[model samples]
Target: SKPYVVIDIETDGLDEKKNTIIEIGAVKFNGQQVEEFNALIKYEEKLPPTIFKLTGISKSLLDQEGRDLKEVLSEFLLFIGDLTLVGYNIHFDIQFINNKLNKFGLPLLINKTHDIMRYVKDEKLFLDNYQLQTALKSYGIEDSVPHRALKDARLIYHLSTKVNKFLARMKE
Candidate 1:
């Protein structure tokens, strides 16, 4: 199997035009266990109450722990170098990252991406929807803290194995 990196990002808000990324989380399998990359990004403005409550990533926390945006992005790019990317709703995270990269004149993430949602859908699981939480629960995967970057990325990484196992069984 090709190497894969599962990624997740927490942002100030949904609109890529208006919001900035606040955190990035990624994990790649090491042919044994998983390796991780996680960073909180420093932003100029305070996070809105809703965002803070949802992500639990307050400005104060970011102020204390955050890294410069460009530096974090550069490190993240290096971490996932040439690996296939996976995520729950993968494109949403990628779009936000690409928006930031565009502002800094950096090349977009051009990595091959696989949406875990598609795999769940193909399995005809979760008749109502393919939301990450829903699929995780249905598959007996332990729930992680919602809306946090690292936790969400870890959940997606485990979900990838679930989907891969289902696919492998189907091929038999």
Candidate 2:
């Protein structure tokens, strides 16, 4: 596996077992910055009203642009290309993904992983709070692309690279 591949998803809610993943985003780290894939997943089920309010993923928006999960997930797994997974609470996202895969009789896709939240807390330097958004702001990353899965996943990949660089420098 390459050192890093980060992914994120915006779902209807926290219940990965029952709810659906609306958007899937990811970037591959191959000693450089690059977005590998960012895709919106469409579900046959309607978005919960609370999810719609929080993520702004309306039924019509999904109806118009959403791709089927089987297709998106397959492509995304390929784009990942044997890389170590990176994400904030990625296990949570994978829960939903795996559940969906099981429904379609497809295999779950993920590799060895690291959580940014764990690193942030371990570093314990700049952040006043332990939230992902707070850590992002601490790094001066204010892209404001909000609520979409792919953009957020790319942002996390971007931020994680910066942190890795700083940590390497500190060890010198």
Candidate 3:
């Protein structure tokens, strides 16, 4: 079984051209937690004031040093290896990654894909809210550090494990 790489991103705005990836957190599971990678992509672009407050990533912190978009994408693909991506609101994350990568004409990451969001539909479970936080709470998983990349990515790993385990117990 391939492991899952879960990711969360904070940006300046939704427009792919206007905003850049300010932070990214991702975790790789190779049947164990030993394989893990996370980082904040130092954006050369200025962040909107609202985005700064929302994500807690100000110019000063981002000033230190970090990977650029292209560099981050390359490293991220390497970190993910042959693993698939597991994420809450899975489609959007994929979209954002692809959108950004396309700017540099780099192909998006590909692997055996599965969305934890789909687990709900597969199990015939309906939720009042399909939001990430709601699903996290429903599965008894805590929120990962918000706006930071690897923290949220690790949280995705935990959430996926919880849901998978829950389904397993139900069968027995």
Candidate 4:
């Protein structure tokens, strides 16, 4: 019932050590939007072609718009504060973020999380796969391709309202 942030990240690849987070997006909400945060971070290594094609976060985009890793993380941490976090498959996102934080010797985030993906799975309401797009489709959101951080973050935020509202009914 408190305001929570829905976070989504876009990375260069799958492995945290081998890859780097290129984008971070979040929306804070109690019922509707409260605030939004998005950052594109500079990555030093080559981006995989599949990730580039999937995310459309081009090498040149990172070069042009990306902020320094530490700078972006600093602002991002402040943006999140101590709010409960919500995301789709949030564990992977936290793992990636913590790896980067550890690389910089910054403190890891230990805030509570509500993974929207896990909630949907627990409800067992989908014939589709657990992919965000599939979940969205089941819920009548024929939205964008599962690509960008901000776009996906907003989608997760919207999905939570439906999920949590039904969960509330179990109490009374």
Candidate 5:
């Protein structure tokens, strides 16, 4: 099995051109707890009220705690290394990151990605929806912060373990 790095990003909006990434969180299974990465990116745009309410990442907080976008993305890219990327509906997250990298002339991430949403659907796990929250609830996992990057990344990590274990059992 390929090693995986579970990742999550909270962004200002869905369109990479118009919105900016606000936060990134990732964790690898082989690393110690202290090795996890969480970075907030500083952006000039005012966050939409809906996003702010969902993420609880206020503009003031980003101004004070956020780092330069290029710098943060560089560090985040290094942290993930060559591990296969894993997330819940991860394409959006990867696209935003790649869009930022494109601006900086950095190469886009070529690492493979596995989506928890796809896995759940492929396994035919009964669910009303395939959203991250819904999937976690089905697995009896609770998230402290529903829209926070770190919480979502941790949730994806747990879901990966559960799904992989289930797949293994089926092969027995």
Candidate 6:
């Protein structure tokens, strides 16, 4: 079976040009196992109070622990290679990446992509409200963590391979 990259990103806000990514997290899975990539991104300016409170990681901390966007994106592209990508509501992630890719002249990701959320909506499963946690509830999956890029990446992985059984086989 082919490896799939389940990716998630956290940004300062919704607009990619005006805002910047604060975190990126992904898990690469090939049927039985996974490898992870997670990074905090250094901001151009001091972290906004609103964003810091929401993410619980300080701007100074990010300056100490984070990598620049160029480096993170380059490494992430290398990590994913040609693997198919899986995500819940991935268009946001891809849009942000591609927009920044234009800024840096990096190649936009061209791998096949599948959205677990899309499948749930198209099939009318939780069509009324299709948040990741909502899908998880339908399948009796529990994730105690409130929110983070990596935590949600793991949740999306569970939603697909375990609950929805879409990306990789569950019967093996």
TM-score of each: 0.90, 0.84, 0.80, 0.91, 0.89, 0.86
lDDT head-to-head 3 vs 5, winner: 5
Among the numbered candidates, top lDDT falls to 4
Clashes of 6: 0
The local distance difference test score of each candidate is 0.83, 0.75, 0.69, 0.84, 0.81, 0.80
Per-residue error at 95 for model 6, in Å? 0.4
lDDT of 3 at 60: 75
**Could you tell me the lDDT of residue 82 within candidate 6?**
87
lDDT digits (tens) for residues 28-48 of candidate 4:
874445799998998778888
lDDT of 3 at 99: 84
Determine which window of 10 residues in candidate 5 has minimal summed lDDT.
163-172
Clashing pairs in 5: none
lDDT per residue as tens, model 1, 72-156: 9888889988877888878899999999988887778988878888788877554676677778877788675588898899988
Taking the tens digit of each residue's C-alpha lDDT, what string does model 6 give over 1-172?
Answer: 5578899988888897877888899988865689998998888776778776767867887889889989989998898888888898899999898888778999998988888887777555544588777777766677753457888798887777654446444233
Q: Which structure is stronger by TM-score: 1 or 4?
A: 4
Ranking by lDDT: 4, 1, 5, 6, 2, 3
Residue 78 Cα positional deviation in candidate 3, in Å, after optimal superposition: 1.2
Runs with alpha carbons beyond 4 Å of true place in candidate 1: 165-172
Clashing pairs in 1: none
Point out where model 4 deviates above 4 Å: 30-33, 165-172
> Which segments of model 5 are wrong by more than 4 Å?
31-34, 165-172
- Choose the strongest candidate by TM-score: 4
Candidate 2, poorest ten consecutive residues by summed lDDT: 163-172
